[PDB]
Structures are given as structure tokens and as C-alpha cells.
Amino acid sequence: DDGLCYEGTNCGKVGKYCCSPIGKYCVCYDSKAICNKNCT
């Protein structure tokens, strides 16, 4: 919840999505929801 989630290639998320306001997180998953949720 403490961050954002978008699609593209900023964390090697080719095929899924990622979450990173700057990089300290850079957490990607297949469930775009897990990206916003589990990422932080």
C-alpha cells in the first residue's frame, strides 16, 4: 500500500507488472494486485 504499480520493464517485469516509487522496492509479480499489495 505504501507505493504505486505500473507496467513496462523497470524491474525486468516482462510479462507481469512491478512496484517502485524509486527502487528500494522494485518488486514485481504476476498478480498486478500482489504488486501494489505484497510489494512494500
PDB file of C-alpha atoms in Angstrom:
ATOM      1  CA  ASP A   1       0.000   0.000   0.000  1.00  0.00           C
ATOM      2  CA  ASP A   2       2.967   2.364   0.569  1.00  0.00           C
ATOM      3  CA  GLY A   3       3.874   2.743  -3.138  1.00  0.00           C
ATOM      4  CA  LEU A   4       2.486   2.523  -6.711  1.00  0.00           C
ATOM      5  CA  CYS A   5       2.288  -0.093  -9.545  1.00  0.00           C
ATOM      6  CA  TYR A   6       2.575   0.255 -13.333  1.00  0.00           C
ATOM      7  CA  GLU A   7       3.515  -1.916 -16.346  1.00  0.00           C
ATOM      8  CA  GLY A   8       6.590  -1.884 -18.606  1.00  0.00           C
ATOM      9  CA  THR A   9      10.162  -3.095 -17.824  1.00  0.00           C
ATOM     10  CA  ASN A  10      11.621  -1.146 -14.789  1.00  0.00           C
ATOM     11  CA  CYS A  11      12.326  -4.322 -12.771  1.00  0.00           C
ATOM     12  CA  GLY A  12      12.575  -6.904 -15.506  1.00  0.00           C
ATOM     13  CA  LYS A  13       8.784  -7.480 -15.342  1.00  0.00           C
ATOM     14  CA  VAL A  14       8.411  -8.501 -18.977  1.00  0.00           C
ATOM     15  CA  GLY A  15       5.061 -10.404 -18.962  1.00  0.00           C
ATOM     16  CA  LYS A  16       3.825  -9.218 -15.485  1.00  0.00           C
ATOM     17  CA  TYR A  17       3.985  -5.833 -13.568  1.00  0.00           C
ATOM     18  CA  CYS A  18       6.110  -4.012 -10.890  1.00  0.00           C
ATOM     19  CA  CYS A  19       6.022  -1.580  -7.986  1.00  0.00           C
ATOM     20  CA  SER A  20       8.748   1.009  -7.331  1.00  0.00           C
ATOM     21  CA  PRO A  21       8.438   4.662  -6.272  1.00  0.00           C
ATOM     22  CA  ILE A  22      12.247   4.927  -6.677  1.00  0.00           C
ATOM     23  CA  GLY A  23      13.875   1.454  -6.432  1.00  0.00           C
ATOM     24  CA  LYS A  24      14.297   0.466  -2.750  1.00  0.00           C
ATOM     25  CA  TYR A  25      11.355  -1.866  -3.514  1.00  0.00           C
ATOM     26  CA  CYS A  26      11.481  -2.929  -7.250  1.00  0.00           C
ATOM     27  CA  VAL A  27       9.125  -5.828  -6.539  1.00  0.00           C
ATOM     28  CA  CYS A  28       7.227  -7.471  -9.420  1.00  0.00           C
ATOM     29  CA  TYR A  29       4.669 -10.269  -9.538  1.00  0.00           C
ATOM     30  CA  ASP A  30       2.113 -11.849 -11.870  1.00  0.00           C
ATOM     31  CA  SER A  31      -0.929 -10.565  -9.918  1.00  0.00           C
ATOM     32  CA  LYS A  32      -0.899  -6.741 -10.585  1.00  0.00           C
ATOM     33  CA  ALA A  33      -2.654  -6.776  -7.177  1.00  0.00           C
ATOM     34  CA  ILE A  34       0.337  -8.517  -5.484  1.00  0.00           C
ATOM     35  CA  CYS A  35       2.481  -5.741  -6.933  1.00  0.00           C
ATOM     36  CA  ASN A  36       0.549  -2.944  -5.142  1.00  0.00           C
ATOM     37  CA  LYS A  37      -0.064  -5.219  -2.077  1.00  0.00           C
ATOM     38  CA  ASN A  38       2.958  -7.510  -1.324  1.00  0.00           C
ATOM     39  CA  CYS A  39       5.493  -5.156  -2.882  1.00  0.00           C
ATOM     40  CA  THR A  40       6.143  -2.949   0.167  1.00  0.00           C
TER      41      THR A  40
END
